[PDB]
Design a protein around this ligand. Structure first.
Ligand SMILES: C#Cc1cn([C@@H]2O[C@H](CO)[C@@H](O)C2(F)F)c(=O)[nH]c1=O
Ligand SMILES: C#Cc1cn([C@@H]2O[C@H](CO)[C@@H](O)C2(F)F)c(=O)[nH]c1=O
Lengths: 306, 311
């Protein structure tokens, strides 16, 4: 059966992700799946991004409670992740085991974990989502398929602020606190994958949060030493501990690649191209999978891309 | 390999599901059948504060016109996410233990509700009540976990008059007969949807045409869950579904079609329901487990869950 390469370009917004990749299919055997802006602004709800930034701004000003903001943020994040969740689910049966040239390369703008883990966790750090909601999203992260190659960004903070200022989505507000939270989350994400792959056991190391791989205090696990999640004696409730077991399973089999964005758009493009030589390809499951996947991807772009 | 029997008792609230589940479990030896309760403690305390009360209060304030549909939707959507969390995690932790479909089972697990109750049925019912968008319902559907082998779901049958009587007597709940009608309709649609799919129905082929299961002829698509999603919000200018929503229905078909549905008549005494459920288990699908230590592991998981979150 023919081979497929899936490449998810992810990481904090405002680094230059949607430019870099736009230049990458810029063709028959590569398809670019862009961010589903139309879903966010129109199809799923009205101006979800505006809704998100306005809610945080009003929380910050003290015009609404943490409680009101959390229910708003939570349902908004549901809208945000929907196109990623449907796409993953319809693609899943087509994905075979690990596998030469690929018959088809899909380059996605973001992986489901952006809306089902990273953004929720950042909003938690922003005081506008409960950690219990975050772990509800985590519990729903689809099982990690073979060949899940995820590209995360590296960019010094000052330069990132400069780029973000020019890359504001419709309805977005330039929020340096959110920028720092989302950068911390993705930093912790990269660390967490490494911790897990080198054989780290969160349950074994959990005691260190109260005291060769990253320290657990430098992974996503540290975020869930939140008091909401803990019994009167300090123990994590089992239901949350199980969500963390799921988090561990999902993240461990991801293939992370770091893309230096502190260079020219053509440079970023070339660097992304270089990275592909180490990415994992899979077979598809049926002979008709390749054109079906192509049609899915192109229909997504056409209908939901800006 | 030793075998496992998983049975999810589901359907509208107020039918006697929870009692039936306990009665059935009380028949078995302690360590060959385990009860996985509604995570009431999660709903009331651990996940958020009094979520059930929040749900019913919000619907009421919508009905009274004290809040907008928009405000009700964001509360209802967040609350439904909270409702489903323990179901999702439990399914995710059980999944790698389950083998292919397959003497008495080494272990029987009786669940109070399947993940689809919180990820599909209640959201769909709330959408019918005007307190959730159909887009959000389809987001929940997109997130329904892959259907494990040997997913036996038992749904309820019960005359509406007896059901209403049962509810008006036997929290945070408020007596809402409109919601009762909605959730009864939704589970009836569900039963039909499984039968429709297993009879080879293709919603895309039948789209233009807009109970019981494991028996009978193929339902009309208008009597399945697919009919709920002919909503103006989901339709393109040309009048077809946007592809994104269409893909969510494809997921809906995929998840439901491999399920094994049974209908239990609740219009009888608690012991009657128990024995009826017991007879029904005879035609239910078991699975192998993936490791020998899966049986005790699964057992501990079920008991830990029950202890922490059961009422
Ligand atoms: C995927 C995704 C998400 C994107 N976004 C935002 O949408 C835009 C994506 O470019 C950007 O403003 C953002 F990244 F901040 C969210 O707020 N939440 C998400 O879950
Ligand atoms: C599972 C479940 C759910 C239960 N419930 C309610 O919880 C209560 C106990 O089951 C009952 O009032 C109910 F079933 F209606 C919801 O409102 N939503 C759900 O998703």
């Amino acid at each position: 059966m023919p081979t497929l390469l899936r490449v998810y370009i992810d990481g904090p917004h405002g680094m230059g992700k949607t430019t870099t990749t736009q230049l990458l299919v810029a063709r028959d055997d590569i398809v670019y799946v862009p961010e589903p802006m139309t879903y966010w602004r129109v199809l799923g709800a009205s101006e979800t991004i505006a809704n998100i930034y306005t809610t945080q701004h009003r929380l910050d000003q003290g015009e609404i409670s943490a409680g009101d903001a959390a229910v708003v943020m939570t349902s908004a994040q549901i809208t945000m992740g929907m196109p990623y969740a449907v796409t993953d689910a319809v693609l899943a049966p087509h994905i075979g085991g690990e596998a030469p040239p690929p018959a088809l390369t899909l380059i996605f703008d973001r992986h489901p974990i952006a809306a089902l883990l990273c953004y929720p966790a950042a909003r938690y750090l922003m005081g506008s989502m409960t950690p219990q909601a975050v772990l509800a999203f985590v519990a729903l992260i689809p099982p990690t398929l073979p060949g899940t190659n995820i590209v995360l960004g590296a960019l010094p903070e000052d330069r990132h602020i400069d780029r973000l200022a020019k890359r504001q989505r419709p309805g977005e507000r330039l929020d340096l606190a959110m920028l720092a939270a989302i950068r911390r989350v993705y930093g912790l994400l990269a660390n967490t994958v490494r911790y897990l792959q080198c054989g780290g056991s969160w349950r074994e190391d959990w005691g260190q949060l109260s005291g060769p791989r990253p320290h657990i205090g430098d992974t996503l696990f540290t975020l869930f030493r939140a008091p909401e999640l803990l019994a009167p004696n300090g123990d994590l409730y089992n239901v949350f501990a199980w969500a963390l077991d799921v988090l561990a399973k999902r993240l461990r089999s991801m293939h992370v690649f770091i893309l230096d964005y502190d260079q020219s758009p053509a440079g970023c493009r070339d660097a992304l191209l270089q990275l592909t030589s180490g990415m994992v390809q899979t077979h598809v499951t049926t002979p008709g999978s390749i054109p079906t996947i192509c049609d899915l991807a192109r229909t997504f772009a056409r209908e939901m891309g800006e």
